[PDB]
Subunit: 235 residues, 2 copies
């Protein structure tokens, strides 16, 4: 509603207020970011279309253009709280501003991917590297990564039908997980009696893919620091 | 398609060929049956509207009329393979024809309630009496009953979103089940490693309700012997 005040958080991020995006501008879609050199653009788009579950694209920028239709007037170089510049497979840094690195390469292409449940009555979410590979696309391949969210045994279904508008459920060993204790990405959560490991797909997989494939240069958001769009979680 | 040949199975049941309805006329909706005296009609309808999940009504007959819009030209007195006449809370018999008992009371009202999954790649189903009560309605109350279907840990969600168009999942003790070994209704199934107890609501609950409430006279289908409608599982 009013559709604005999401443009107010982005505004605080230009000034340079690093911070998680959790709960902020609640109601408006929030996304992950992956920007690769043009010569890798086709491959990511293919990978994204071939693996819609773990790689749902909301918008792709025009080569070298840091803007998005998901939030007219924004700037992907400064509107996120924190970024991760990746060089030759590795992590080179973690700036609150990517203007500098965007200027490095001329034809850069960015992919925006990325509460109603809590309205029904239901750190960084523990994520695991599965044994379930994705469909390859050019130089891109790898197994999808998953996010574990402990759901009560009575709203798991209600978690399925509600979100529909989960990749795995229970049996963690069936996707190659022998202990929720050691997630593939730090953390660990308190999974109580009566709760159930519900797994999800997210922007880590597409990320882990480019990473493991030796992409020379890449820009991403820093975990927990997504790009808040002007799109209301209802379209 | 052709929408007929479901009227061919019903036809075999008039002759008197008791037998399960499993797999028959696949593609066409199949239902449970509950027929109570008029003076209980209002209560069941209320109970049914107040508990849509465990009591989904597809059609209600006009008092004393054994027909249904769900299959023009059928006769609820002879078109099911086997029936259960219930007298004063108890089970009085199990005939293949209910014509006789329908003639007993003048204003009888029948409720029709009641594969695509197996198209995705996914005895009598084990059912349990929970600890989760339904919303009462007049002389009707009681806890919903559930059906357990062992679903692979990768199609549980896919079992939720597919059927949407489950009441509980996992944690059986959270709904008052301390051992899937002894179902509330005989049977028992082989729940393998990597599978997950997925619970469902069905016509037993509405049945168990009328039963435990002392309804003098009632007619039902016999487990596994439903009424096959002319409605295709796609409307």
């Amino acid at each position: 509603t009013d559709a604005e005040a999401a443009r107010k958080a982005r505004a605080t991020y230009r000034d340079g207020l690093v911070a998680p995006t959790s709960g902020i501008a609640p109601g408006f879609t929030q996304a992950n970011m992956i920007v690769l050199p043009r010569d890798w653009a086709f491959d990511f788009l293919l990978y994204a279309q071939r693996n819609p579950k773990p790689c749902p694209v909301l918008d792709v920028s025009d080569p070298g253009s840091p803007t998005t239709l998901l939030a007219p007037g924004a700037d992907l170089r400064t509107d996120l709280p924190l970024y991760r510049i990746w060089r030759d497979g590795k992590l080179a840094e973690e700036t609150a501003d990517a203007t500098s690195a965007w200027a490095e390469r001329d034809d850069l292409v960015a992919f925006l991917i990325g509460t109603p449940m809590v309205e029904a009555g239901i750190s960084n979410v523990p994520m695991y590297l599965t044994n379930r590979p994705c469909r390859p696309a050019g130089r891109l391949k790898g197994n999808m990564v998953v996010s574990m969210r402990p759901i009560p045994a009575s709203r798991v279904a209600d978690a399925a039908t509600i979100s529909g508008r989960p990749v795995h459920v229970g049996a963690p060993e069936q996707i190659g997980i022998s202990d929720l204790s050691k997630p593939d990405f730090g953390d660990a959560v308190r999974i109580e009696p009566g709760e159930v490991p519900v797994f999800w797909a997210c922007g880590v997989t597409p990320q882990a893919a480019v990473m493991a494939s030796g992409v020379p240069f890449a820009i991403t958001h820093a975990p927990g620091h997504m790009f808040i769009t002007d799109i209301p979680d209802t379209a």
